[PDB]
Amino acid sequence: SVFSERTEESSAVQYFQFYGYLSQQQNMMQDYVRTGTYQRAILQNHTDFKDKIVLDVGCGSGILSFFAAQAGARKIYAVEASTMAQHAEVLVKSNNLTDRIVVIPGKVEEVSLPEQVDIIISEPMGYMLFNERMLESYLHAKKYLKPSGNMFPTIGDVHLAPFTDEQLYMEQFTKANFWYQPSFHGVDLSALRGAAVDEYFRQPVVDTFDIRILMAKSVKYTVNFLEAKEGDLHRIEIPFKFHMLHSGLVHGLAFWFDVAFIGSIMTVWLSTAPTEPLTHWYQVRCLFQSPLFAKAGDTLSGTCLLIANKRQSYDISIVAQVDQTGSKSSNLLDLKNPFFRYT
Amino acid sequence: SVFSERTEESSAVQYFQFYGYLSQQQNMMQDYVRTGTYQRAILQNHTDFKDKIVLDVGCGSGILSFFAAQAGARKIYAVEASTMAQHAEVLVKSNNLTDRIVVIPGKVEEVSLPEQVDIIISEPMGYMLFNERMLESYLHAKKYLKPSGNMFPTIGDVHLAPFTDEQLYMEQFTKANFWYQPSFHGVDLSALRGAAVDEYFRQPVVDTFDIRILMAKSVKYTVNFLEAKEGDLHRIEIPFKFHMLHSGLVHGLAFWFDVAFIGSIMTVWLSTAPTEPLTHWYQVRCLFQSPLFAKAGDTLSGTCLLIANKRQSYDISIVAQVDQTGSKSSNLLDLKNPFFRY
Amino acid sequence: VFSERTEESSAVQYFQFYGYLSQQQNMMQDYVRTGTYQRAILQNHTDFKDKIVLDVGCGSGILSFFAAQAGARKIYAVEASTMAQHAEVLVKSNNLTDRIVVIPGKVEEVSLPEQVDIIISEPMGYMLFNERMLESYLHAKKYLKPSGNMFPTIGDVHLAPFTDEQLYMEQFTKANFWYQPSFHGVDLSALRGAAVDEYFRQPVVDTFDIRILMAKSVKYTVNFLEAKEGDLHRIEIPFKFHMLHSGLVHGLAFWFDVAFIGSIMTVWLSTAPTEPLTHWYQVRCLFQSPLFAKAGDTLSGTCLLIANKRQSYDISIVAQVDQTGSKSSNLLDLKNPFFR
Amino acid sequence: VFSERTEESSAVQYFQFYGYLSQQQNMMQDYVRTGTYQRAILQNHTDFKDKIVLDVGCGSGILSFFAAQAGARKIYAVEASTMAQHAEVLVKSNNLTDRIVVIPGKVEEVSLPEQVDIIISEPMGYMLFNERMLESYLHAKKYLKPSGNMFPTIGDVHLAPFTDEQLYMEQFTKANFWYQPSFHGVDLSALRGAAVDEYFRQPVVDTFDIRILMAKSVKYTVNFLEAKEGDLHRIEIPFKFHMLHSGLVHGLAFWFDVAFIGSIMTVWLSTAPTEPLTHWYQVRCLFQSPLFAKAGDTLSGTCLLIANKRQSYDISIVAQVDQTGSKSSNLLDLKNPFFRY
Ligand SMILES: NCCCSC[C@H]1O[C@@H](n2cnc3c(N)ncnc32)[C@H](O)[C@@H]1O
Ligand SMILES: NCCCSC[C@H]1O[C@@H](n2cnc3c(N)ncnc32)[C@H](O)[C@@H]1O
Numbered sequence A: 001s002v003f004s005e006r007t008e009e010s011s012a013v014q015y016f017q018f019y020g021y022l023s024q025q026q027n028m029m030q031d032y033v034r035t036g037t038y039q040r041a042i043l044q045n046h047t048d049f050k051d052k053i054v055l056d057v058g059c060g061s062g063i064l065s066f067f068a069a070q071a072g073a074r075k076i077y078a079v080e081a082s083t084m085a086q087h088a089e090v091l092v093k094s095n096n097l098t099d100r101i102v103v104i105p106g107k108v109e110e111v112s113l114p115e116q117v118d119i120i121i122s123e124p125m126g127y128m129l130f131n132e133r134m135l136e137s138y139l140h141a142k143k144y145l146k147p148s149g150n151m152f153p154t155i156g157d158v159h160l161a162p163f164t165d166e167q168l169y170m171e172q173f174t175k176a177n178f179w180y181q182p183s184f185h186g187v188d189l190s191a192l193r194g195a196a197v198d199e200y201f202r203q204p205v206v207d208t209f210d211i212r213i214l215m216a217k218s219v220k221y222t223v224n225f226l227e228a229k230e231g232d233l234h235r236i237e238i239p240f241k242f243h244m245l246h247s248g249l250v251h252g253l254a255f256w257f258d259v260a261f262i263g264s265i266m267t268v269w270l271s272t273a274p275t276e277p278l279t280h281w282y283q284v285r286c287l288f289q290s291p292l293f294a295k296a297g298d299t300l301s302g303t304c305l306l307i308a309n310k311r312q313s314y315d316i317s318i319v320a321q322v323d324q325t326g327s328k329s330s331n332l333l334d335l336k337n338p339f340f341r342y343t
Numbered sequence B: 001s002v003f004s005e006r007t008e009e010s011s012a013v014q015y016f017q018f019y020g021y022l023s024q025q026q027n028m029m030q031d032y033v034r035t036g037t038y039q040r041a042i043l044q045n046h047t048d049f050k051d052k053i054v055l056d057v058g059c060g061s062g063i064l065s066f067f068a069a070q071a072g073a074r075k076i077y078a079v080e081a082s083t084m085a086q087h088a089e090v091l092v093k094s095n096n097l098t099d100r101i102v103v104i105p106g107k108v109e110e111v112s113l114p115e116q117v118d119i120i121i122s123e124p125m126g127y128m129l130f131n132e133r134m135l136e137s138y139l140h141a142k143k144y145l146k147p148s149g150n151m152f153p154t155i156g157d158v159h160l161a162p163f164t165d166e167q168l169y170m171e172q173f174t175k176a177n178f179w180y181q182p183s184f185h186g187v188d189l190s191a192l193r194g195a196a197v198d199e200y201f202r203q204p205v206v207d208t209f210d211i212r213i214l215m216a217k218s219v220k221y222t223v224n225f226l227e228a229k230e231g232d233l234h235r236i237e238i239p240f241k242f243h244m245l246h247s248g249l250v251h252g253l254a255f256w257f258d259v260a261f262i263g264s265i266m267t268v269w270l271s272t273a274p275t276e277p278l279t280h281w282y283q284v285r286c287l288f289q290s291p292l293f294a295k296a297g298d299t300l301s302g303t304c305l306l307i308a309n310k311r312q313s314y315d316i317s318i319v320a321q322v323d324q325t326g327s328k329s330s331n332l333l334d335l336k337n338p339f340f341r342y
Numbered sequence C: 001v002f003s004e005r006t007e008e009s010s011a012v013q014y015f016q017f018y019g020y021l022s023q024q025q026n027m028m029q030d031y032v033r034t035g036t037y038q039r040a041i042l043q044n045h046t047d048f049k050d051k052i053v054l055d056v057g058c059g060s061g062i063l064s065f066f067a068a069q070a071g072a073r074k075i076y077a078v079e080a081s082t083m084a085q086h087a088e089v090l091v092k093s094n095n096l097t098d099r100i101v102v103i104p105g106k107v108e109e110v111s112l113p114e115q116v117d118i119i120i121s122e123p124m125g126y127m128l129f130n131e132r133m134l135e136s137y138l139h140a141k142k143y144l145k146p147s148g149n150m151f152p153t154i155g156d157v158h159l160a161p162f163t164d165e166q167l168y169m170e171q172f173t174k175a176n177f178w179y180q181p182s183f184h185g186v187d188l189s190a191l192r193g194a195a196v197d198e199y200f201r202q203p204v205v206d207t208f209d210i211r212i213l214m215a216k217s218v219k220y221t222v223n224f225l226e227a228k229e230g231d232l233h234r235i236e237i238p239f240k241f242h243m244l245h246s247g248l249v250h251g252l253a254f255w256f257d258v259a260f261i262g263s264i265m266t267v268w269l270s271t272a273p274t275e276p277l278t279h280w281y282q283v284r285c286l287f288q289s290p291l292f293a294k295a296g297d298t299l300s301g302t303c304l305l306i307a308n309k310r311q312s313y314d315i316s317i318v319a320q321v322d323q324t325g326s327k328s329s330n331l332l333d334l335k336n337p338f339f340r
Numbered sequence D: 001v002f003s004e005r006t007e008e009s010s011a012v013q014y015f016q017f018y019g020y021l022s023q024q025q026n027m028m029q030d031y032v033r034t035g036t037y038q039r040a041i042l043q044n045h046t047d048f049k050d051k052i053v054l055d056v057g058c059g060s061g062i063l064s065f066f067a068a069q070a071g072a073r074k075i076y077a078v079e080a081s082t083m084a085q086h087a088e089v090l091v092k093s094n095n096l097t098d099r100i101v102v103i104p105g106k107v108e109e110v111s112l113p114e115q116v117d118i119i120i121s122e123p124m125g126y127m128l129f130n131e132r133m134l135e136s137y138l139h140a141k142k143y144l145k146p147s148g149n150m151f152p153t154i155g156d157v158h159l160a161p162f163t164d165e166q167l168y169m170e171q172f173t174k175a176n177f178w179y180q181p182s183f184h185g186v187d188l189s190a191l192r193g194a195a196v197d198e199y200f201r202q203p204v205v206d207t208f209d210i211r212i213l214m215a216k217s218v219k220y221t222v223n224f225l226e227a228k229e230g231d232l233h234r235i236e237i238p239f240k241f242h243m244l245h246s247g248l249v250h251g252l253a254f255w256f257d258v259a260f261i262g263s264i265m266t267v268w269l270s271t272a273p274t275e276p277l278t279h280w281y282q283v284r285c286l287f288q289s290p291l292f293a294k295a296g297d298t299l300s301g302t303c304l305l306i307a308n309k310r311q312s313y314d315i316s317i318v319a320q321v322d323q324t325g326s327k328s329s330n331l332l333d334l335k336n337p338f339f340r341y
């Protein structure tokens, strides 16, 4: 299948085991911004669901499918590849919706549906949107979508902005400098200090922050889920050009994302921006190996290149320069192993 | 190999990727109780190492191999399966010990050593001692040990005692109450209420506690690494009989372990007991799904059974019974995925 | 009448309870109750001076004495319990035999010599409606002249959603006893559900800090001057709260105010948590499962009171968060409350 | 039968009270009760091995399960309240439907179809006799085979004179609320006497230090194997205390024991103040007037318990100092005890 060809089995096993836990479903369902906005988006656009045929990709506990039922859907095909599919069936039975909701255990790339659907629903967004690469399953499912069909969410926006955070940057060296000592119980560790620094800088930092650390207006990269193909996400190039609001040192790029549910009645936004209430996605920061100095008005230009890997994630390559000085910097990060720094 | 048969590849990949990170090594090294005690055990028993052949199973950054070098060992074969082997070699070079420490990348079950060894060193202890199932790799390595040889650590003591902690119990039972909701956004979740409770109570709790929650003297189970076979650890059965000292509710069993480095000069103990300084192993508590009552003087008997699984961990089944009243409690736990409460 | 709306068993224990002097002392030591009652009557002594009074449930007779102090020419004090004997004793020792006339028996049965200008009583129980004495209080209007008055004149019931994690776990903990799979070797888990219901059928009587209230209270008024006896067999109270803070709603809090709409001034007797504590305290009904609501949401539903023959009420509460559809329903027995 | 000696009003409230699971819970949490009962049965398994058992007032059915553990063949479990319903469930879930047979109704009204080898029950109330369930227990002996046994087998009530100046003063401090001339302009004085009498008619349910007891206890035994239910309608307990310490006696302290005389051993369930506290506590009845006694004097008199239609007893106590001739008495309503703990 398409899934098995882009995923190393070792990764797939752990991925679906992780989602078999009810504790994980609970944690996600307890994010009201997530749960609430989806319900609102579906219910306030009931004309997109009323007596329609619905596909739920990675339904988990099946919460989204129930929302589709509340909106008046005729039939909902809820697909789940983990063992959470068992528990989903239980809830459909106990909620007496066995006649409208059909739980299909398996991967959406492998199962077969009896008919085309009017709309696909899913919550495939990971850290800075693309983590988990589930967006590709979401786009793959479009093979079951009528040419008239819609998708919730309809679009995805990733936001990039440069930040200054001296404490975050110094932290990496404070920790790595553990290795910079000549006699740890008689052992000179200093030779591994360089390797420790690199390791720490390869980790995207997941937490939140005061919006005042952002030094320029954000750049936006949009994915239209109605137009995009699976292969469009294997390699995501995000050029950027930041016009600096304040003079100072830039220690890296901060990331967040929005998704919009563009229904017939109204558009509903789900935002994980630092200006909005915190969500379980938090925000993501990628440090530069060397800070770049830029005075206000200067231009910080470069490329953020996301390369998909077999571990259901992305290799992040960032290159940036100050146009006026030629001062340059880069970094390579592994989005699969982020550092969770939130209190 | 022996390793690949007992281990799901998925678990192995994740396992050795975890230990490939320097940050993990730093964390273990900063446990000064661990590092200081290991160094003490080796150096104060330096006669066991001087001019001897040493095998370091899972050397990681190679710290123990450096201790064995400090003690006068002539040759140290340091086996490491993760990519940390490359970092070890770097440290060996930069510490000018190339003539004495030989890094051998690979699994101990798969590599071939040039000669038999006088002593095997390693730190195969995980949560509850047995997690990670690395004691088996430790024992497997005995195929390279001379008959006169020794092993550091030499033995492992598992301690278990009944505890009372209403707060912890409510805490875990409370998280399962989420799945009692009859209308979460209009959806009835209560059908999954039972499975939720099971899932949360299958989690061993890793943290520390005041020793006054323990309601009886600990029971001890000893594993002799010199005499034990690999297969002996596939199924570990620990019967217990506690004589209750105080009256009240027993919410579960508390676990910790000691290991002894039985050297020629001196025996050195590394203890993770709640009476001892805290280590990165902490202690482990398995909760009963329902607490049992017992008066002081009563007898609490049962068995703790550890079933090895292919995810490099154990399936824990605990049956407890108040002999005087017949009050019974049974619970299963997945040692692989515990709840870190600290 | 009273006999048909009341099981004999309940009536016996009921009037036996009010035959004890220790209970009268307990009620009289409530200086909020006694003081406010005395003020309401004396401040509006024009409604009593040289008037005909009916004391429905005089007990020790304290209210009738207040009516006497106000200047009432004749006071008919009706009491069903044996406390009627004690009242007569006090009437004689206070030299008021020409003013206060004790009449043993139930108000629904006794015959009075003349119509009265005003009826006085204190029929308010927990949540105001407990004891179902308001009905007897209304029934007594048959002796009330047109243009007459009633003390209390009206009754306000207040409802508000609260948050109290501790209280919720307290009642859940008690129900967790029947989860034991081997209590002395016996499996009790089969009755876990029945236990949960039972404990959550109990209204909680106690006081609390007003900061637990997550919205402004709803008001439900019962005008005793216009209310018919039949109106209190079934009482439906619609409520629509606008949540002020975000968090878990563990239930609804209950208290009541009664007003003495007198000639000179209206006097209020409040059991609100903002007001000094009374022997009525407040009453809280717990949801079997709390509902989550964010500030700005609306909590809608209906509190339904259905009178039973045990001189109490069967309280059905249904509540929902209109924005999310989060719903909760619980039935409570007002007869057996839990005092903590 | 039950209907003849019980007012309907009392019967309603009595069985409603026991229809609550919260009530069964509180009793099962008394380890002394549950423990001793389980201890008594299992340690005398010879009296239960493959036998037929009758459980009078099984409640939640806890006792029936204990008999089952001992290897009983059949157990007839009778329950008049709605708790019988929940008992049905626990029998089903514990897979003992083929051994335990629940019967809804009064033991003196239900129709039993077989004779039994032993009768089990918990009839003890405050002062043992309260609730008068001890008569249903004896009534059930009509289903008992001769030579059969009973658990409990005997019941002991213990009487001792106590001195408690604080407890005696409390009654007046409370009643003296009425002794004021202007409570909000009202003279309550005339009811003070009535208030005093009312308080003194209430037996006090709580615990106390053994040091207040001024003489070794007297004991009155009820042999449940050798007694008819009529024997309990009127219980006369003559007493004669030889005073240890010199002082004032404010009343009599009550507590009880029951024994399970099995083939293997006898097991005692004690509610004495010397033993760990139970949900029965102890009971004290005040004299209207304290009696002064010298160390050596003898406090004689009788404690007369008269069964009433309210499933309880009217308590008449008369006592005198023989050396002085000073006498005091009191009359108490055991249905309305004052819980002071
Ligand atoms: N809030 C961020 C987390 C979103 S919940 C992701 C859900 O989609 C399922 N899932 C993932 N890939 C899938 C696939 N190819 N087919 C079916 N289900 C899949 C996965 O098992 C989980 O239940
Ligand atoms: N708290 C105690 C932590 C234990 S450190 C475990 C160390 O031994 C390595 N290791 C594990 N199993 C191994 C095997 N079979 N062969 C070689 N190296 C192995 C693993 O990669 C890591 O470096």
Ligand SMILES: NCCCSC[C@H]1O[C@@H](n2cnc3c(N)ncnc32)[C@H](O)[C@@H]1O
Residues within 6 Å of the ligand: C002, C014, C015, C018, C027, C056, C057, C058, C059, C078, C079, C080, C081, C083, C105, C106, C107, C108, C122, C123, C124, C125, C133, C136
């Ligand atoms: N704080 C709570 C207020 C209780 S004081 C109400 C008094 O009125 C009596 N009473 C009750 N129902 C009655 C009736 N139908 N007729 C006459 N007296 C009655 C009752 O016995 C008591 O003495």
Ligand SMILES: NCCCSC[C@H]1O[C@@H](n2cnc3c(N)ncnc32)[C@H](O)[C@@H]1O
Residues within 6 Å of the ligand: D002, D015, D018, D027, D056, D057, D058, D059, D060, D078, D079, D080, D081, D083, D105, D106, D107, D108, D122, D123, D124, D125, D133, D136
């Ligand atoms: N401290 C120990 C308290 C004793 S528990 C009293 C139990 O005996 C039942 N019971 C009482 N009288 C009964 C009768 N005549 N018939 C059947 N069940 C009866 C009553 O319903 C309750 O379950």
